[PDB]
């Protein structure tokens, strides 16, 4: 509705996650869930989502782009500049990032921007 | 719940400027309206590439836009794949997307 339209226009950062080389896939899935649970009430954060990569189809109609193996995709929404700064200044966020350090081997962030 | 999601990394053709690509992303989005079997479509530009991560940074080269498709069920997905307008839509994708990486995702919570 109106809500989803304005939400889509928030500050959004999308992440490609690669699990640590030594961590099992089973454990990585559990730590993704813990990381989502830890996001509840995170100051300044409007929404968090984390998903596993379940499939890597290669029969594309466009030339295929190989980026190596990605294990999960994360995404953060912030409603405003002020809320992003609340988040960046938060000690609760710093603890969340400590947990990230445990279960994320490598990370690619994209800050996105809306069109129409 | 039965929801299927596919996320795409899009690189523009070398024959296109960034502005030309932006305009074709808008066209692609407009084309997608009322697409058979599709629940939601989103396309957005990559505006920034922060590199001060607190874990090791992963370089995947230059990604220009992110697309995402939602399908409410497996049945909706098959209606989409057999649609003639979806096939024409994919032809437009061949025009404005130089390279792309699809990810089929799975929900965790």
């Amino acid at each position: 509705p109106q809500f989803e339209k304005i939400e889509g226009r928030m500050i959004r950062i999308l992440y490609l996650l690669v699990k640590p080389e030594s961590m099992s896939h089973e454990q990585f899935r559990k730590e993704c869930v813990v990381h989502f649970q830890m996001s509840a009430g995170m100051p300044g954060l409007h929404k968090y989502e984390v998903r596993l990569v379940a499939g890597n189809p290669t029969d594309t109609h466009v030339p295929y782009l190989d980026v190596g193996r990605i294990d999960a995709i994360g995404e953060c929404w912030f409603a405003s500049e002020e809320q992003y700064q609340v988040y960046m200044e938060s000690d609760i966020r710093k603890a969340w990032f400590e947990h990230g350090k445990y279960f994320i081997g490598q990370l690619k962030p994209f800050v996105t921007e809306e069109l129409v | 719940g039965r929801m299927i999601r596919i996320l795409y990394l899009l690189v523009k053709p070398e024959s296109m400027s960034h502005e030309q690509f932006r305009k074709e992303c808008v066209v692609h989005f407009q084309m997608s309206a009322g697409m058979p079997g599709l629940h939601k479509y989103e396309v957005r530009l990559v505006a920034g590439n922060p590199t001060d991560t607190h874990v090791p940074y992963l370089d995947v080269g230059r990604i220009d836009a992110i697309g995402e498709c939602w399908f409410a069920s497996e049945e909706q997905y098959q209606v989409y794949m057999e649609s003639d307008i979806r096939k024409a839509w994919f032809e437009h994708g061949k025009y404005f997307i130089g390279q792309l990486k699809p990810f089929v995702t799975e929900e965790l919570v």
């Binding site: - | 992303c25 309206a33 939601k40 939602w70």
Partner: peptide
């Protein structure tokens, strides 16, 4: 840009 049912 997005739409949804």
């Amino acid at each position: 840009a997005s739409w949804s049912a």
